[PDB]
Symmetry: D3
Subunit: 306 residues, 6 copies
């Protein structure tokens, strides 16, 4: 019975996202970091029992995997597929390792990040670093409650964790990350009612719009995906707001976990390429992806056997 990383953990009030690439000859340094990552996690985490809720999820990219490990590959691991839509593009950017660090306070996140990057100095190049913060009652930079429909319990376990379809990597998951910057000026130009028709939910109360009123080009409509089975295909999102007031940056840092990248990729295609009913997701008219990467987050015990 394999132990997964904290991919099922709930959202926290603080987060750090680290994306790095592995320099020439950096493999060895990276390998024995990976073996110590859980150790470093407890070293910092235990200081803030019991309300700390510190966790680190480590992801490894497609290219990076081959450099680090001989043997089998996760069945679904590949580079993030750039999507060049008629209007909006989902860019792909470099990234070998992901560190998704969460806690109830930023100090814990920062302390852990410091230890991780301290061990990696001279072996990696930083691509992206984001300090996410909770924004009021679980809102995003668009002013909407964000994460409502995340699966819970058994439903989440079956949606997120690799199982018998790839037995060797069971307990693992696939993370997709995209850094989105928002055009607040354009968004603020819309009425609340217009904004609601973009998302597919009521702004203040977070109640889902009726099927009668919900536009087919609304975010909720596009990202509702039914399989050939007839079952709802779900991902687990741990999105965090970030930004800088002076540089006029108001951002959503998207991260989605699923047992297969196909699920996430299908949703991305519907958003960026569109469907029969919608040219594209209307949220992208106010959101611009600036990064895009895909990582496999292995079971905890896989990392510990290095």
């Amino acid at each position: 019975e394999p132990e997964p990383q904290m991919v099922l953990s709930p959202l926290t009030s603080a987060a750090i996202f680290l994306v790095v690439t592995i320099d020439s000859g950096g493999e060895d340094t990276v390998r024995d970091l990976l073996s110590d990552v859980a150790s470093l996690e407890r070293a910092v985490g235990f200081r803030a029992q019991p309300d700390g809720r510190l966790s680190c999820v480590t992801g490894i990219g497609s290219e990076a995997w081959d450099r680090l490990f001989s043997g089998a590959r996760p069945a679904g691991l590949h580079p993030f597929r750039e999507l060049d839509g008629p209007v909006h593009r989902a860019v792909a950017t470099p990234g070998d390792l992901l560190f998704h660090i969460r806690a109830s306070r930023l100090d814990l996140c920062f302390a852990l990040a410091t230890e991780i990057m301290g061990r990696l100095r001279g072996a990696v190049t930083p691509q992206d670093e984001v300090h996410g913060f909770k924004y009021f009652d679980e809102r995003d930079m668009l002013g909407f409650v964000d994460g409502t429909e995340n699966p819970t319990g058994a439903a989440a376990r079956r949606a997120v964790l690799v199982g018998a379809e790839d037995p060797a990597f069971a307990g693992g998951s696939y993370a997709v990350v995209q850094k989105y910057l928002h055009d607040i000026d354009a968004w603020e130009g819309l009425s609340v009612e217009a904004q609601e028709r973009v998302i597919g939910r009521r702004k203040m109360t977070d109640v889902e719009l009726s099927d009668d009123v919900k536009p087919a080009d609304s975010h909720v409509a596009l990202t509702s995906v039914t399989g050939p089975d007839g079952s709802d295909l779900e991902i687990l999102r741990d999105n965090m707001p970030f930004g800088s007031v002076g540089r006029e940056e108001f951002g959503t840092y998207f991260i989605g976990y699923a047992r297969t990248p196909e699920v996430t990729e299908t949703m991305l295609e519907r958003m960026f390429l569109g469907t029969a009913s919608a040219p594209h997701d209307r949220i992208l008219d106010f959101s611009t992806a600036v990064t895009g990467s895909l990582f496999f987050t292995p079971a905890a015990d896989f990392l510990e056997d290095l």
Copy 2:
């Protein structure tokens, strides 16, 4: 199937450790209590839900077991084995009943302890009583984070709970207790770096030392045990600080839980007797054990059925 006691429950900010012996003719009263202990826990505990976190783990010693129950004995149940090392000594002291009381508040611990002792008045003799308190960011009296490498989840479950190896006592655990008093004067005479080498971890940050910087006689080295399997042998520790400023008492109350005492004893033998590589555990140069007892903590439904 069987329901364990709160032996897996996490560390709290307040604790009471109570160790008593059973007087001759006190058996009836003791059994009578043991069957009511869980209901006493609820009586006090329910008042302070949801953030009370009151729990009581009840342990029974080897000698006490024979006096108390006729029937099968837990396989690993034996009295604490005293260790006479060349320098340091792990003493064995009397103790028939263990009450490990934890809560987020001392009052809850005190109230429960009062109800238990009220019932045991003329049947038990108190041997030890410690009031434990959280010290800053989970520090011990030596100034180091304490409990870091405790197992969690399924790993904790395998390491602590008696399973199929002893079916009639499935859900049980073994608790070894030792009250240590520290020589703070000698300790604060060392530099931080020297203190780190004694422990095997950085002081401020709690980051484990590199394997080729970590001495063979450091606490972490000697308490790192690998079995014939190749797997790590783990115990679950609920150490609490305690002490009196006026009496120059600065202490660590040691309590380790494991599915078999053989694990704790191996670690204990390595600390006191040493290995090929190490004479003894350097931590013992600033720590004196003044008590030493071993208890079996039965599954909850074992206590309840005593009736």
Copy 3:
């Protein structure tokens, strides 16, 4: 595999109890809501993660069930049985739908209640609405700690959830509600020791009286029932104080969950009708039931599949 409602979750500091009857023609509106109740819960509840502890348990009465659905019914689903004792009486009052709404904050309960009633407006008539609040250290309005002997963990699941004895409704539960009013004047006429003999537990410390001192007509003695096989018959209770000072109204809202109504009813019967050694439960000399209803709380998946 069937997912239950939050019937096993603990006491919270705030609760709203809502009982309604379905107006003629309201059936369709009611069915549509039942399928969205879980969705409304998440919508409101997610805003207050993770300290919110918002839950809703929906129950359906015997007569309501026959109006809403066709096919098989839960084995034990019947209207509340009136108990006409020599002295005290347990009355049966109308109620088709129970909404048991709990949270750590009243605002959360009220918001959810608003959303539910908003969608039921003109289809249902309200029968009872009670806003419960925690009173000191889990005390009821009689000044005694209330809920101590509730089952926990496995025993709770055993006592509360329908299993193999009614396989088509596994994961369901039966909820009996009764609104009690206390005569505080009469109660305060008693000494503490006398009140203790009524309940069967110490007032301040909540320690149970020993078997020699505990009277046969005490509340604890009468509600202690062993089955034919010697096993204890248990229910899960989520009682909440309520009241109005100006009206001199001091109440306990009784709600008890059990896998079969036979367990709860045996307790009612012993209370109101008495035993061989007790004419009735002494607590009833200071407590008057002004409502009485029985509901079946289906498994969650039952509701969403409407």
Copy 4:
């Protein structure tokens, strides 16, 4: 002299209790008034330091002459009924006001119990409201309520009677109105329209610019400059309350001021209007069902009733 907790901040729970003194009740009421502070401590000390239990006792105009023989507060008179063209501010009976606040309802209820237990047979209850915090300090209209309350020294100058009436220094005047809202009508308005009624942004609580702020907006009409140029200010401890089944969604208004003239001017502008505005637009969705004026003496006035 020592004032009552009239400057004390808003809490998450409140009980408002308004009663009339029955004939022959004067002596029982006088006894209570002397003990009210000690009852407040008896209950309150149990929940230090996060209890924040306080009780402000107010006395009506008619009640004052019945109770006291000496001088009267200069500003004390019965609430003036305002009969405007469209909207009416009713004057309703009320001799004593108990404004009870704490961080938890149980504390409020406990104190109210003790107070009414002593007043039974001497007083008749007129009104009882149990108020609760609603999200981020919102009212039932969904707007942040209390923003412009004076703080620090400004509050002291606005609320506390001073040298203008030296024998009652440390006192204050409290106006209470119970408002019920028409939530159906209100939710028929767009957010932008609702903002026009109130005079501030809904979600962000930012005041509308002076160029866009309607003259009949709530904020416009309750902004009153004195003949000296500076703004008249009152301290508002409004609480939401209600009952879902009965479609009762309410704001319990209570305003403190060093003279009623301030509060009455403000009320006149709302009900009667200015040259540029017929009446307050908030009143198109809000109906006042009670109206009472009370003087809240300095604490030492109450206890020196020995």
Copy 5:
């Protein structure tokens, strides 16, 4: 006007009381500590801003004062007066320095006590050390809420702080300490109503007994003292429960602050010697004093200039 020590500070959930005698020739070491004690307080305390609430009050005994300082003495400073009543006795025990350490956490108290004693090592002998803890809803070991009638605000200031009557020591206070052990067995043999007549207040509710039911030999009767002008003489109490279950020690650590010892001593005389109306205080029938010391707690700036 000088800075007082935290003698007006509220009750906390944790406390360490530390009483020592100064060894022969240990005066210089003591003087050095006294001048650094505020630094030590801030050194430890700042780590737990802002919920730590760490404070230290330093008291100096009568005999110790002469050994430490030359010149003026506080007017009311003398050794504790032993009271040998007919039945009960208040013993005088040695004490030169008192450290009254409070915080919301024991760890902060222990840390500070460590630093203090670390400096005093070899210059003092410890006489008494007690670790106090909050017991439920501000209760003592007798099960009664303890500290209800403590003065607050300007009343506390007037009752506690030395003023113009001794201007050289303005801002100082006098502390009386007594360690009491309770006979819980005997006390738990009384009915609640008997216990109430001993204390003079209701047990659960903490409401004071009316003046026609309250016995003359009750605690509240004998400790209620009216002064020349007819107003109550008051002290500030920071009582903390303590004890050891094994040794059957259930204790109250009594500490009372007053601007003059004469107030506390009057109360003690009434309690121990009795009046014409009362043989002695009934609380003494269940409580034995084992220590008894009197200290002057000088203004903070007195300690600093040393």
Copy 6:
């Protein structure tokens, strides 16, 4: 004379915002200044219980003359650059300071959004820092930071402008410096060596005895007795900030005082040193990147625009 929230304690989160006023932006700025308190209330009241939202507004010396006519605060001047032998205290541009504090970063960010939203196209951002509490009130050097801050009346007397400048009573002077730390170098030192640099014990925060404390320790050099004989004090609201990837581990220094002379004397002893000390030893591990001086007026001053 109602002052700004300058006597207010440390919070878990902070945003420091320094801007320059673009040419012809005077009017827009003056208008914001009159509304800043109402914007603070608008956001702050939402979390009324325990939000602890505050905003202190500061105005630079050159900015003052562009905005207001008449009386100038006596001690208001541009930040004096100090070019020492080894270390340099740089002066950088800054017209407006917004010192925003709350118990939550969201509150800070929202207020900053509203402030900056109103100032768009009238100001140029110079610096933005998101500060966060680090464990038990520690800085990036691992030391408890702010211990010897004055409290109560001592704080009020040390920080608030009084009779010496009656036109601006209830004001204060704020000095800001963004420091970056050489963590590699710092963590090479032993704890004992670190303690000699600071002048206090690392873990316990206990001050070293006067006989073991080096003359070039931070604590020794910043301890200044005035010509009057009493200790000179400032109120520090230092916050850690940083970025792990960039290798940025910083202390945002902000100190409030009745007169800038007090703060400047300390700076002088740190960068230039004394007879017995070359410079503050903390500076061998700390580089100042910004340096600005602002006057923070009384609250009522801002309202009467």
